[PDB]
Amino acid sequence: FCGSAMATGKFLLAYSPPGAGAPTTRKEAMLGTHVIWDVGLQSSCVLCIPWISQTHYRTAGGYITCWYQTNIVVPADTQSDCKILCFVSACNDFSVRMLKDTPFIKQDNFYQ
């Protein structure tokens, strides 16, 4: 959370297992796997997702959602809204087994 140090609020980071589907209300999120992210106490939250895997050779994968448990409370009037930054990382348990060409580079002709 990248708001002011005086800002206070609560977020509900909800993890949906694969095949469960994305929750549609804050109550369905609360009834599943979730953490109450209190902005006032800690400005960062870390979540480790156990079941990731690939999905194809070349939905039904799990979801992560955030909900407004409370609103963001501020002492004074700030014109701009707060921002949240997300970071993803690999844990020590990934395997990779079959190298292939990446789909994000293209070379349709020679350079010379």
């Binding site: 206070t8 609020g9 609360m30 009834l31 796997t33 109450i36 209190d38 963001i72 002492p75």
Partner: protein, 248 residues
């Protein structure tokens, strides 16, 4: 620092060194067999229900009277433990009640967070009994009023009497916790199962209610958020139900 608590598939974060009010000094426990009692009243525990349930936050405003929930009814539709109430005739459980408050240092106000056992409430009409809807709305908070309530079967929700015909300032006799925004923002009340019988039907009876009454009204500086969220998180403790298997 900050302490993270996980129960089942739910996680919440609480500040360390936060006071916990443990009911009447009794931590919730399971029922105990009395000198190897016979299998005439089998009991069945459930540990999957020991998870946090987070009700929708109630918006605390400047002219905002209290709220209340009746937790046997307030968790009656919260997935499990609600299915357990529906399936089992007799139930028994304690609760850990977390009351959060998200406000900045520029906010004012004081809250009385009290769990009142057997909070039988009067009716707005003297020759009547309040209906189920007014008494307990389930996961939705029922609100106190700044004046006398009107209704044939409505609860007398004037905050001065807390709906019970007593002094609201004397509500501290029950397990309570004051939330002063300049000092506190959290309240943790661990309520043991209190009843005149070891187990009882849960749809038919409310063990206790939680009243969140703002004694000092909410206030803020110009430009600050005019409302403050109050989040109630509930973890059922030591949930027991009547055994459904055949005794022999």
């Amino acid at each position: 620092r900050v302490r993270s608590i996980t129960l089942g598939n739910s996680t919440i974060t609480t500040q360390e060194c936060a006071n916990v009010v443990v009911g009447y000094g009794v931590w919730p426990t399971y029922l105990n067999d009395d000198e190897a009692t016979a299998e005439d009243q089998p009991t069945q525990p459930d540990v999957a229900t020991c998870r946090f349930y987070t009700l929708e936050s109630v918006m605390w405003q400047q002219s905002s009277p209290g709220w209340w929930w009746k937790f046997p009814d307030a968790l009656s539709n919260m997935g499990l433990f609600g299915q357990n109430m529906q399936y089992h005739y007799l139930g028994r459980a304690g609760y850990t009640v977390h009351v959060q408050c998200n406000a900045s240092k520029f906010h004012q106000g004081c809250l009385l967070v009290v769990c009142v056992p057997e909070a039988e409430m009067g009716c707005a009409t003297l020759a009547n009994k309040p209906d189920q809807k007014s008494l307990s709305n389930g996961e939705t908070a029922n609100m106190f009023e700044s004046q006398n309530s009107t209704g044939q079967t409505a609860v007398q929700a004037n905050v001065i009497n807390a709906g019970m015909g007593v002094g609201v300032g004397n509500l501290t006799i029950f397990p309570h916790q004051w939330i002063n925004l300049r000092t506190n923002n959290s309240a943790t009340i661990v309520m043991p199962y209190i009843n005149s019988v070891p187990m009882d039907n849960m749809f038919r009876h409310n063990n206790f209610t939680l009243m969140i009454i703002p004694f000092a009204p909410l206030s803020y500086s110009t430009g600050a958020t005019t409302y403050v969220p109050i989040t109630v998180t509930v973890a059922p403790m030591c949930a027991e139900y009547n055994g459904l298997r055949l005794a022999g």
